[PDB]
Amino acid sequence: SEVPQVVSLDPTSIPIEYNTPIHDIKVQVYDIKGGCNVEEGLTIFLVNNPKENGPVKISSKVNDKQVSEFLKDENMEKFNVKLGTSKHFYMFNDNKNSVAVGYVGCGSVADLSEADMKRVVLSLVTMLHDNKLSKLTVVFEINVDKNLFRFFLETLFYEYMTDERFKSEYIKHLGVYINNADTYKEEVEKARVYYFGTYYASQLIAAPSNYCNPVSLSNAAVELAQKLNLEYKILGVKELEELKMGAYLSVGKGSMYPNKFIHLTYKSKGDVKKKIALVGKGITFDSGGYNLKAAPGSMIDLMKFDMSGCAAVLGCAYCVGTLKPENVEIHFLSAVCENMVSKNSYRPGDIITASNGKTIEVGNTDAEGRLTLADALVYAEKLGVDYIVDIATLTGAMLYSLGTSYAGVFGNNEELINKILQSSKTSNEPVWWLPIINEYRATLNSKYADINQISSSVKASSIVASLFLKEFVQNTAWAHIDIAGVSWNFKARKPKGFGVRLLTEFVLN
Amino acid sequence: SEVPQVVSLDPTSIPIEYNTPIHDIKVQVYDIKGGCNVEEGLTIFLVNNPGKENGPVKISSKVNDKQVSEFLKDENMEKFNVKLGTSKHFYMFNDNKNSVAVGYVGCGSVADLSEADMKRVVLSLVTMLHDNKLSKLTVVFEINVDKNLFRFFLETLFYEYMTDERFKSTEYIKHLGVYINNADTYKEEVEKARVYYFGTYYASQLIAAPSNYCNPVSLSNAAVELAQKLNLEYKILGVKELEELKMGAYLSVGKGSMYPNKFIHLTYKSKGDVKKKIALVGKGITFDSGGYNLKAAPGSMIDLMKFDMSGCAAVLGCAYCVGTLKPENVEIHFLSAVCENMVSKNSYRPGDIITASNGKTIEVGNTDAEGRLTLADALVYAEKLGVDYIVDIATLTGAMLYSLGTSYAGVFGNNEELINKILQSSKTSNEPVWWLPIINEYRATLNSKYADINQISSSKASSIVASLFLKEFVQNTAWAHIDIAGVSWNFKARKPKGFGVRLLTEFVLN
Amino acid sequence: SEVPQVVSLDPTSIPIEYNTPIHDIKVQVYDIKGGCNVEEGLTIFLVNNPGKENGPVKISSKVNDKQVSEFLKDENMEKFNVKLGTSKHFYMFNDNKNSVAVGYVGCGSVADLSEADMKRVVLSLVTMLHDNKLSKLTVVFEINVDKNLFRFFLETLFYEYMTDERFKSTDKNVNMEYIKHLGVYINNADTYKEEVEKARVYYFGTYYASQLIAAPSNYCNPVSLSNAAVELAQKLNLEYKILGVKELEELKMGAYLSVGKGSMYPNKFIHLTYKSKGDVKKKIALVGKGITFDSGGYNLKAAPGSMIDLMKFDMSGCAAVLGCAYCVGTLKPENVEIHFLSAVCENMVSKNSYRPGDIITASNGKTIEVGNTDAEGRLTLADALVYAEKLGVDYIVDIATLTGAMLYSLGTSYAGVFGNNEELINKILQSSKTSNEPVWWLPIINEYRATLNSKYADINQISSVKASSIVASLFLKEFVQNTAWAHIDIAGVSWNFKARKPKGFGVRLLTEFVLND
Ligand SMILES: CC(C)C[C@@H](C(=O)N[C@H](C(=O)O)c1ccccc1)[C@H](O)C(=O)NO
Ligand SMILES: [Zn+2]
Ligand SMILES: [Zn+2]
Ligand SMILES: [Zn+2]
Ligand SMILES: [Zn+2]
Ligand SMILES: [Zn+2]
Ligand SMILES: [Zn+2]
User: Fold this and answer.
1) Which class would CATH give C217-517?
2) Which residues bind Zn(2+) 2 (chain A)?
3) Which overall architecture, per CATH, does domain B211-510 show?
4) C-alpha–C-alpha distance, residues C369 and C355, integer Å
5) Selection from B48, B84, B128 nearest residue A442 by Cα
6) Which residue, judged by its Cα, is nearest atom 17 of ligand 1?
7) How much of chain C is helix, strand and coil, in % rounded to 5?
């Protein structure tokens, strides 16, 4: 619980913003039928043109003569609907009050993807960050379903919010005009919850490794559990030794921060008809160990993000703990540690023993995630659960295979895999199914240990890692989500909080 | 048609073996319900034991010989186990008092065998064939296989048994017996397998041929020769017709070569009425040096890059199978933009803007991404034919080794139905393929400042970005792209797989 | 003159846009003391707030419209701040009940705008011009600018506003609509009026240079580049001469000829000349590196970071020289004779290429040991400098994308200048100040000269002292015997990586140099 320090100026906790300006925003949703009022603030129309880079056309009654003249076809024709393009103007309305009116181009395709919507939102966020507004009103002259509408709000809330914890005028009202308004009203408060779960997770990821270490991360986890009335249990070195979790403990041998195993539990006050375990990779810093990240491209300044899985899980815990779904018992697990170089570090070639008795030959100390997850997976299966889903920034190959938008899912069960893809669809956190190819299993056959940590090959590293993990689930439906490529937003230089909404939709639906 | 030379010792054709020792093998299939006869040669029993770890081998099959039956009694066989890949050889005398040889191959613990360890089963069998000067091989199936897997057994047996000695200078069986239950249903698979094998081995021959032998002219010559031995309409476009067709992307790639570009266009048409028109496109880079983006990086594998025409080989390999089996109600076009990517005073340069045959201007960012340039023009041509399906197959991106590896190929496309047909074809051909996404969000990375489009991204999903490129040259036709860069070469055996041939033939047949 | 081809689809000339939409813009400058008329298009105020960091916006120019004046009152305007780069659009009706567009661009709180600051200001202006279909732009200067800062505003505005579509076919922009009129309100307008057409000229010289650079190497080759230059000389009535290979052979330019040996394109030496109608008090030779593509040769650019796709850029010096030729040929300065020189070739990999280790002989007799074929620029420049000095000139200034080390030394904004004469260098610095193309003076360190001592040849091409920009300047110095000479290394500043396009760097610098003596 007490965070060790090297000098007195070393941080002993992660700063967390719980009450964000987003929570102060009153959201009202109206149906476009009946006309739009353009009293105060900034009003943005979401317009497309099914053709490409075509002219903007507003087709919604505006209960204001002055702003209608502005929105006349001849004047709006100036402007085009290219995805992400926007223009906003300041003017006097009938009350000659100063109002701002504009649009965001939504391309030429009727059905907007999650990527398209983000681009729509970022442009919207760009106008909000340069204006001293009181109210933002968005008019939907495009087609979006209930899930995409919620995705819109979530993304708006998340991108609008700015993290100033390590640094030394937000809108107070949000208006929305849409067709089946009464059907969309319920998605508003769900978005507000999903946003913070993601933003909460983001905060942990963005937290530098001197702030976010195994001790402070587990401490932060306990505090969240306490605020939500979740049962919690933190395993220390002595208990981990008694549980024989040698793989997980080996990775952390070289750290000044003691290993901390995070175990939260949500249990429903009804009948329990589904037990789910969520496992997140919690490497507070990945130096690579003795296989130090020194090669051109390793991105070592990166590696505080190696606990993104843990963040997604804790972020998920917030959402579930807030929404309190029925008929479920959920375990939020993370084997948290730090992978460092020391006199005490574990070595390449070392043979270590996991909690299920299997000996593992370490071939690369930078492949630390599968070791911590292995012992985490054994712990999970002993709980007697229906599904085990782990989420991890495991392999960089994901950047070459799937890139920065879609995460990969691996598994031993097609039904479980299918539930994750559906959750990807309704949460709009894109996931693609990748195969666990049994032919590669032999490359993990060690000469001295029961199994290799790695293949001698760089061929199919994400798949080989899934084969490894597969060895630590005996008789349980299990899935593995590799978020190494999608976790960090390189363009915006911040986390995405990837996985929080995905996992929440999985538990709820 | 005439291959240019630098010295008089430069080869002017690819040596091709059409009649292989496999074709000389008389194959007979009998039903197990009648007993197995021995007498001659080597007889191998394929045995498993479902539900035991490495259980004892037990023969299940009446042997029409009293004392090879006594030899095969369980007390004698309990010794031995069915561990996958395990094999033993037996010497004994039959009823007549003559010397016979018998043995077995273990098929593991799983009732339903692999696609991969059927390969190991076959590989184990071939071990028995290489160190032996046998005249007859007999295989008894005491495992259960469906119609597709049996054909696959023969194909793999044929392919692995065969040895390529075309480039060497300074004992094959003549009969194959198969004992299997519902033999009468399986007999139809025998000649289909032999056809599928050679189409694959034919592709293998073209792929294995070094680049001084296999160049744009000689490969195109070989394609013409194939069209003639089959009876397909054929036409080869040289530099002059290609200029008239304005195929600037394809022509740029070959500018630095001593070998003129040759576009291969074979056609199979059924005498029936035609309900499906299909264009099959293969990447045909006879050698990929990388150009001015020279392969000087450590993982470049500059020595194996004769393999960069695997797509073309798969397409031509398919052409053999289709041309022999003569399917109904279908019209097939075999297309390949064949050229060589070299470094020269005449070679295309990084930064260059070139114009494709559909009018789109392209900024070349990397000369080693040459395949998509040739395929783009090949794809424009394909759509001009007015077909229902366009499928290209290519060793396009090295990233496939990192994504799917050396066993599974990746398939991309603009049409889910076509993707599923490729997928089904993967199951029945047993050439494993996995569906990968075309992520439209990465399309913006191909937006060039001066040309219509970039050839490459700056940025890493190179396989996905390359597919995004290709999609731009198919406007309104169902199209799929198979990236076999990772699976084309069998690194362990130091030989090609001829991957894609059987997949494409099963694709057109269904 | 005839460009050789590999296939018939190979381009045989560089496409050049001469009549640009910028030239079609009628520009008027009015005095602010008379008030601003707003009544079409978009009207933009360049605003400041001296001493208030992100301070409030306040318009201070009489607006000859009651409705627009009321809109622009301080009470309405304070909601906005003057943050440098900030911009806003306003919609309103004027007294004649017509809809007009008005806005502002923040010019910060610092009285004196830098060259970097002014560009940022302009960039924000062009954004308002893009994606909007305006017919008129009116710009109001509520800041203080001298004439060459004012001129810099128009040049940069013109340059950034213009979009190059020579190589688009199926993706030309559907919405490219240029304004037809440009209005400017400024104090003491009669003093600034002279800068307008000077800006237009400075703009095109720069854009012409940008066009040559942006043109890919299959379009822009040694032959096609010399041809456009000749066509350029003809349109300006300049004396011109292009040297082919065996004229170069019998001027014995072995270094220059070596670089092009591996190319399918013959070497072409550009020699354009401007002579004043009057008596000549200054003779100047301008020498530009003209490598239409730098592959590196047998020292191939294969290392991570070599940026081989960008190397069609290697003739930026040459382009800067021709862009200057345009400006000089148009403005017709007095008492001056200018030689515009460029030894053009392409550095390629071939059986005919020159090799590392080769000893070659320059036109002044000095033998050179080649240590790196990617150090080709100094070889072509060596012979060009000898040619230049034989012209009997007073100042020789060469401009070249010579060393990537400039990225490590000065970065992407400032070019480096080397020289053998302080008077010339300062003139370069003075022209840099008035052209607003930033240049910094770097030393030629003689102690490093010994690293060029070859065992067999008279001199080494390169060092074995990783201070490469200085070593290269030491090399170049060896081919100038008794003439004031300066060397401007633009390897770091020529290409705009963010905007993914050329800068046309050097044109305004070189022209201001010629104009001010
Ligand atoms: C340049 C294209 C990407 C193709 C190229 C290739 O993949 N080169 C690279 C390499 O071998 O290091 C590489 C591999 C994986 C990921 C990125 C880059 C392959 O040689 C080819 O010629 N394909 O047509
Ligand atoms: Zn690691
Ligand atoms: Zn890690
Ligand atoms: Zn290549
Ligand atoms: Zn290739
Ligand atoms: Zn060079
Ligand atoms: Zn150069």
Assistant:
1) alpha beta
2) 281, 286, 306, 368
3) 3-Layer(aba) Sandwich (3.40)
4) 10
5) B84
6) B399
7) 35, 20, 45
